[PDB]
Amino acid sequence: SEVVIRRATAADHGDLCRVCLLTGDSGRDASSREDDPTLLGMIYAVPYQVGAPDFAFVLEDAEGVCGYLLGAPDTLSFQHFLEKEWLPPLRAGLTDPGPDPAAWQGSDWARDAIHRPPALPPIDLAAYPAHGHIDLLPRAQGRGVGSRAMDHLEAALAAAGAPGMHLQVSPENPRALGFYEHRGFRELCRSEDEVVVGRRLL
Ligand SMILES: CC(=O)SCCNC(=O)CCNC(=O)[C@H](O)C(C)(C)COP(=O)(O)OP(=O)(O)OC[C@H]1O[C@@H](n2cnc3c(N)ncnc32)[C@H](O)[C@@H]1OP(=O)(O)O
Ligand SMILES: [Cl-]
């Protein structure tokens, strides 16, 4: 049952994508919903390791990678990386299912997100410049591993000078919402599609 936090490497990309897929439907398995099992992790997980390698970690137990913990200390910096170094190769040759959500199937929402990324959420980026994401496989859930992992990431971002961080959570993931509330994160904004929570770090 022992889980350690280890620095992530490019050798972990495959496992990042797997964990991303297995938790990408508001925290639950999205495999049945996506037609491309890699897009999710290529949009939401892999670029953290490539663009912010000093704040990317995996959780690993005897069976192998059982989660990840990924951060970026500065939203503007990381968007530069996405806009100039990640989204362009991702777009090359990439089918565009059109901007109308009504015709989309499977991973089409993800293709559109790549061609036309969403605006950043309506929050105070000076107060909460850092951000991150955590996802544990069920085998590593329910026993404080998320708590220890969030301690690690909050500390790493604080050590980099970040005064606050925000995280995006699905409104249909009330477990994660309750998890963050319990850690002293407050709700910064809420739409029918997304909740953003934040905490000051210094
Ligand atoms: C910002 C994002 O990354 S959103 C996506 C989050 N990822 C997911 O939902 C993927 C699937 N689930 C997970 O990865 C994990 O379940 C996490 C990260 C959400 C939580 O990590 P876990 O290790 O499972 O937390 P655990 O359930 O053990 O609870 C840890 C603490 O929070 C408390 N807590 C946890 N969930 C809740 C809750 N839903 N409501 C109130 N308190 C809660 C627990 O009682 C415990 O309290 P304690 O430290 O005082 O004893
Ligand atoms: Cl979520």
Author numbering: 3 to 204
Text taken from the publication that reported this structure:
Dynamic protein O-GlcNAcylation is achieved by the interplay of two essential enzymes; O-GlcNAc transferase (OGT) and O-GlcNAcase (OGA). Furthermore, bioinformatic analysis has suggested that the C-terminal domain of hOGA can adopt a GCN5 family acetyltransferase (AT)-like fold. Strikingly, close inspection of the OgOGA genomic location reveals an open reading frame coding for a predicted AT immediately downstream of the OgOGA gene. Sequence alignment of this predicted AT from O. granulosus (OgpAT) with the hOGA-AT domain (hOGA-AT) shows good similarity (30% sequence identity).
Crystals of OgpAT in complex with AcCoA formed in space group P3221 with one molecule in the asymmetric unit and synchrotron diffraction data were collected to 1.8 Å resolution. The structure of OgpAT consists of mixed α/β-fold, composed of a central seven-stranded twisted β-sheet (topology 1234576) sandwiched between six α-helices (two packed on one side of the β-core and four on the other). Despite low sequence homology, the overall fold identifies OgpAT as a member of the GCN5-related N-AT (GNAT) superfamily. The thioester group of AcCoA is sandwiched between strands β4 and β5. The side chain of Asn175, which is conserved among the GNAT members, donates a hydrogen bond to the amide oxygen of the CoA pantothenate/cysteamine link, while the NH of the same amide forms a hydrogen bond with the side chain of Asp137. The acetyl group of AcCoA forms a hydrogen bond with the backbone nitrogen of Ile136. Analysis of the OgpAT active site and comparison with the ternary complex of Naa50p reveals that His135 is in a position to function in catalysis. As expected from the crystallographic complex, wild-type OgpAT binds AcCoA (Kd = 8.7 μM).
